[PDB]
Amino acid sequence: GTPALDRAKLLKQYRKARKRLFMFDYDGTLTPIVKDPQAAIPSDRVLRTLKTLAADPRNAVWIISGRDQAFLDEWMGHIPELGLSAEHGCFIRQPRSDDWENLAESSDMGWQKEVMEVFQHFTERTQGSFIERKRVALTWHYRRADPEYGAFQARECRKMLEETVAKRWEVEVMAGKANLEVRPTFVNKGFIAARLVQEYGTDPAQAPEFVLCLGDDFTDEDMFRALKKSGLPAGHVFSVTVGASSKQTEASWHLLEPADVIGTISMLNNSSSAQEYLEH
């Protein structure tokens, strides 16, 4: 478990830091979990909060999301300073750039040819199984197969992929409940988060003196893991899960709800020179 984010400590390091890095999951983190993805179109409040945070050039503000490129661009893309990572690391837009990079297309996806061949082989030999093909991930499904033989086939297929495909291309093999998935290593949010920190270079004095990383889910845990490996001073890094104190997490802190996340970012925004004046 974790204590709630110490907002006083956060604000103090924010003020002290000359360079700040923010990495936010979107759904479940900046906005509540909902059934209808359109109901999680950012409220005006969420958008104001992000726009104000990103306006300060001392801040590098990243949204790291499973959402489509078209969704992030439509609803948040008008804030030019936001860095956007969409579709599980497959599309990236740097702060202040109009250009999206297609990271899948920038990679060698020759592995897909071999994985399809292997999956097709096991499919023909495992009644009930089938292949799901997405842009970047390939998934072999076998829930409808005999449970024991399906599991056996999946163990055998996984071993084969690990000893061949995974040693030639930068991909990993995942096991879901009744599935096997192959996807690029760059899909992992920790990969995404480590890359962002290393972009600052190998010079300590050039590193950000403030990192706030927020996320609610299992994939976001990999961001927290990566930051624990960053080599940055502990008091400079705030890995924060969204969830209860009793939640087991790689984060060091929690905030209970997206409303608390927005409230926390608003507190940081209100330390601006302009806001401090208006406040008196």
Side-chain angles (χ1 to χ4, degrees):
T2 58
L5 181 60
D6 186 332
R7 299 207 188 180
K9 283 187 178 171
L10 186 77
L11 179 61
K12 186 184 180 189
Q13 190 56 26
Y14 182 75
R15 286 183 173 139
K16 189 173 177 62
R18 295 178 308 280
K19 294 188 206 163
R20 300 84 161 254
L21 171 65
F22 294 86
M23 298 179 295
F24 306 140
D25 195 358
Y26 177 66
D27 290 287
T29 299
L30 292 167
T31 198
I33 299 296
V34 292
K35 189 170 174 189
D36 177 14
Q38 287 290 96
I41 279 163
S43 78
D44 290 349
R45 177 173 296 272
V46 169
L47 290 177
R48 280 196 310 275
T49 303
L50 290 176
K51 178 179 180 178
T52 296
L53 186 74
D56 186 334
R58 298 174 294 177
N59 299 334
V61 182
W62 283 86
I63 309 305
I64 305 170
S65 172
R67 292 277 196 160
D68 292 351
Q69 173 189 13
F71 180 90
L72 292 187
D73 200 23
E74 170 142 44
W75 290 101
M76 282 169 263
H78 65 288
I79 305 164
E81 300 84 358
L82 289 181
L84 302 171
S85 171
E87 297 187 37
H88 304 94
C90 288
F91 288 95
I92 190 170
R93 184 198 78 176
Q94 296 293 325
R96 298 178 187 77
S97 174
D98 289 331
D99 302 324
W100 285 87
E101 172 163 15
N102 186 335
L103 294 173
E105 279 291 303
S106 301
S107 78
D108 173 4
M109 293 190 279
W111 60 266
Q112 292 202 0
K113 181 174 177 167
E114 192 168 349
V115 172
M116 286 303 296
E117 194 168 343
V118 168
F119 279 174
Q120 179 63 30
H121 185 261
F122 277 88
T123 297
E124 294 162 352
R125 289 151 182 81
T126 311
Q127 183 69 7
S129 70
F130 68 94
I131 301 166
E132 170 185 15
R133 179 153 202 178
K134 290 210 172 186
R135 188 207 312 275
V136 209
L138 298 180
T139 306
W140 187 56
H141 294 265
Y142 59 90
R143 183 56 188 103
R144 292 295 298 272
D146 176 70
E148 293 156 51
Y149 187 60
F152 168 68
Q153 290 284 71
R155 289 191 297 273
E156 302 297 289
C157 181
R158 179 178 187 171
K159 174 179 171 164
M160 177 160 302
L161 291 173
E162 287 168 339
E163 289 169 2
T164 55
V165 178
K167 288 189 154 285
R168 183 176 175 182
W169 291 272
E170 290 301 310
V171 297
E172 61 192 355
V173 192
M174 317 287 296
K177 174 49 57 252
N179 77 48
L180 287 189
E181 178 178 343
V182 184
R183 69 187 193 180
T185 58
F186 62 67
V187 168
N188 187 284
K189 265 190 187 181
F191 182 102
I192 299 168
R195 202 195 56 69
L196 269 176
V197 170
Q198 291 157 359
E199 264 184 9
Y200 284 84
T202 61
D203 180 16
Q206 281 289 90
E209 293 163 276
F210 177 98
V211 181
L212 175 61
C213 175
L214 282 149
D216 66 308
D217 70 21
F218 183 84
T219 88
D220 291 328
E221 292 290 317
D222 287 328
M223 297 196 293
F224 309 144
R225 280 191 191 92
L227 282 174
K228 281 165 73 167
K229 294 169 67 169
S230 72
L232 300 175
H236 292 4
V237 176
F238 303 84
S239 290
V240 187
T241 192
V242 177
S245 180
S246 60
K247 173 181 176 172
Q248 189 170 310
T249 181
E250 297 280 339
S252 300
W253 311 94
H254 71 275
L255 289 170
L256 291 175
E257 300 287 349
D260 302 309
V261 176
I262 299 302
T264 294
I265 299 165
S266 296
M267 169 187 75
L268 298 181
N269 286 340
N270 289 339
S271 72
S272 76
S273 291
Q275 275 310 315
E276 285 187 335
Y277 188 85
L278 296 177
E279 166 204 22
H280 295 83

